[model samples]
Target: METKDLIVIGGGINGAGIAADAAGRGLSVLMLEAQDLACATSSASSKLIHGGLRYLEHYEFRLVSEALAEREVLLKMAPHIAFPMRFRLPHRPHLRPAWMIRIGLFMYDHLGKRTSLPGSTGLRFGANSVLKPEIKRGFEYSDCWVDDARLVLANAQMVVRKGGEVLTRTRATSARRENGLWIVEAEDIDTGKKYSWQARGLVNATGPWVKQFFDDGMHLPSPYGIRLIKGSHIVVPRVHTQKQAYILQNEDKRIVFVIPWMDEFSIIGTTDVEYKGDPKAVKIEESEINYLLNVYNTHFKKQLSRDDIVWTYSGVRPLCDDESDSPQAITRDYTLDIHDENGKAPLLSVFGGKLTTYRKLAEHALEKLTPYYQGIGPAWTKESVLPGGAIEGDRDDYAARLRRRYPFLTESLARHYARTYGSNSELLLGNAGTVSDLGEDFGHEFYEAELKYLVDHEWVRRADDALWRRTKQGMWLNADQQSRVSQWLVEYTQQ
Candidate 1:
């Protein structure tokens, strides 16, 4: 049997980015995602391409600085989902001291090798009427916001463009080192057919399930433990202001990000607690919902309750177990345990990471393959654009050009395009004249063309796949509408 160069077992940000990078360097790659792309922690991130501001307090200077530095490279490449976000933190003695935050923001602003992004500044919050009166004193700093799902899809698209194969709803059934290659078998979840491949090497980027593959099945041994952390978020209609995403302190010192999501609502989230349950069957517990509501309602003028909530989602962050007592304090650094690299086939298993550092994480993974892929080309993806985000000017000028080119598109739709497609909005919109050409409306801003775009080009397979995983379009979609769209996709796939 012919052997493939590599097989990646997950389709999250890290898996997709690695496949793209490896394939670009002339290695045949295959990426298998058990569900829709970004169906897990990739889509469930805080939606920021940022260095963790809170990490500085824990003395994680290296982690924070590396993520901060990679910010510009990703922005230049994806500009759409990832762009600068100007955030203001209301100065409160009850929280950290103002001088301490000021110094931290100073380091955060300058730590990264920024080009177009600005440094941190203290703003007179009362003068800024747009903000709530409670936030009378504040400091403003810059970070990038990302469309978490689209970011993953962008890397998947790049993988496809570079001659890599991606299979969604596919499970890698089993694997063993035979002769000089790893014999991996996978079964199609939709169809009961089994497929097998011979690979010189394989990557297990299976997020929370990395343990089952690395420890139990392969039994190759690794250095780390899979610390499953459940972080849940609730979506509320735009309670916070636009232009700035508020990073507020919960009474317990854990920070909650009230970010601008969709066109009308704010996405608040992320309570981190240790999760002992299976990663596949994770959801937001009722207590988490009440906890989120209480935290956000404390500072905002409006009293938000469970009724204000439109949707909720959860993902288990496969964090590296750094032996911290609190779940939130677990290290976000990624460690790769390369197993059986002698004469036997090689297996690389990943443990613990964050979304912001995915691209660099992929690079670090490939650094291990230098011994095998000696004839391959050198690294070239540090500044390369992924899929649709090709733009000449900065993200602002890119958005401006979209409006000037076609004045008919609504401002809401324009932002949607910029957020999802980045500088490549022109490539998708082209010269389409009417909303009819965009095709049938399922709900909210989604149209038939967008769905077709997802299925045909991207690896989307279901209604919830599009609405929830691909974008937060599900929040605006009613129950009946969701059922209708889901049924249509089911029948379409069946036919």
Candidate 2:
């Protein structure tokens, strides 16, 4: 069997990021994903790239500071998929005093270096405010909005660009330490074919399946316990006209976010509750819906109920067990546990991480592995942009240029392509001078051209991978349209 420098198990953000970082550092890497990239927690984020401002209350200064700094780093690294956004915190004196809130905001602003994003300020609402009249004063602060799943995709693409192999729909069935190397066996989920590889080092970045991987694949006792916290979100029609997102304080001391999503809709979420079910089969509970709806109705003039919900998603956060009293109190910071027998082949298991600090997590993961591999390069991702992030000027200018170059593209289509693919939009366009050249319009602005690009470059294996993760077209397409796209993907992949 061929021996690789490293083999990372998982296709989530952390795994992809680690694979990308290692590959860039001249390490031969092979990443195995049991399913599509970011098909779990990574894709199911609340879609914010902010430091956990609320973590300040829990006294997690290290996590908050590191995440805050990463916000600036990631914005510069992937301009197309990430951008700054202001979050409005509607002050409720009863939930938290103004002075306390003010102090929290102060720490939030100074926790990390603030460069391009503006600072926080107080706000007073008037008659046209989205909140109730009684909710008068609030504070607005800075954060970022991201295409979370695409962020993972970008890292996976970077791995490929750096000469690393990423295999999706391949399950790592077993791994064992043999002859000072890790022998790993994986099975193709689609084809019943089996494969094996030898690696000097191994990483279990399986997100929610970190423990399960150790049990089923490695047959080793896990060093750290994991807590699965289920967070659920609901999508509704645009709740407010303002582009700024809202962070509402609830009576339970937990806060919920109401953020604008996909231009035409708003996403409200995230009730953190203890989860004991299968991670893959997790879904939003009725109580979670009631909890989120109650919080939204309490603060907003425009109330929402189950009837108003357009969609809902739930994800399991595999938090390293801190044995906290409540699920909400579990730390979001990641822990990297490296287990090796007297300097033999090393095994690193990742536990507990949020979307905002994935780059740092990758850097930290590599730093831990440095001793195992000689001649490893120094850290480089902070200064490098993700795939297709090398646009020369403002993204809007690039979109305009795309429209000028491809006159047949609608303004919306041009903007969508530019934002989704960045400088690679031209590659996706691929010499198409007219709409007809793009071939097969699959409803909305989705075309065969874009779909082909996703399949070719982005490892889009299924319709949901294209519509939901690669793009938000799932929100625009109806059931029949989605079915047609799925059928097309099936046929295309066969060809």
lDDT at position 286, candidate 1: 90
Each model's total of backbone clashes: 2, 0
Native-vs-model 2 lDDT?
0.91
State every prediction's TM-score relative to the real structure. Answer: 0.93, 0.99
RMSD of 1: 2.4
Residue runs of model 1 more than 4 Å from their true location after superposition: 127-135, 393-411, 422-434
Give the per-residue lDDT of model 2 (tens digit) for 1-495. Answer: 478999999999999999999999999999999989999999888988988988999999999999999999999888888988899999899889999998989998898988888999999998889899999999999999999998999999999999999999999999999989999999999997999999999999999899989998888999888999999999999998889999999988999999998788999998998998799998998999999999999999988879999999999999999999899899999899988977979998899989898899999999989998888888999999998688755456878987888889898998898889988898898989989999898999899999999999899989999999999999999999999899999999999
Off by over 4 Å in 2: 392-395
What is candidate 1's lDDT per residue for 1-495, written digit by digit as tens? 367789999999888988889999898899998888998888887888888899988888878999999888988788766778887677777778888998899889777787788888877866445545776787888888888888899999898899889999998877788878888888889878888999988999989888777665566555677889998888888885566888888788888888887557888888987899788788999989988888777767667888888878888999878878988788887887676546456677788778889888888888877567657777889869887678665444766677777676677777677667666566566557777777677878687767766677777788878888777777778999888888877766677
Candidate 1 residue pairs in backbone clash? 80-422, 238-265
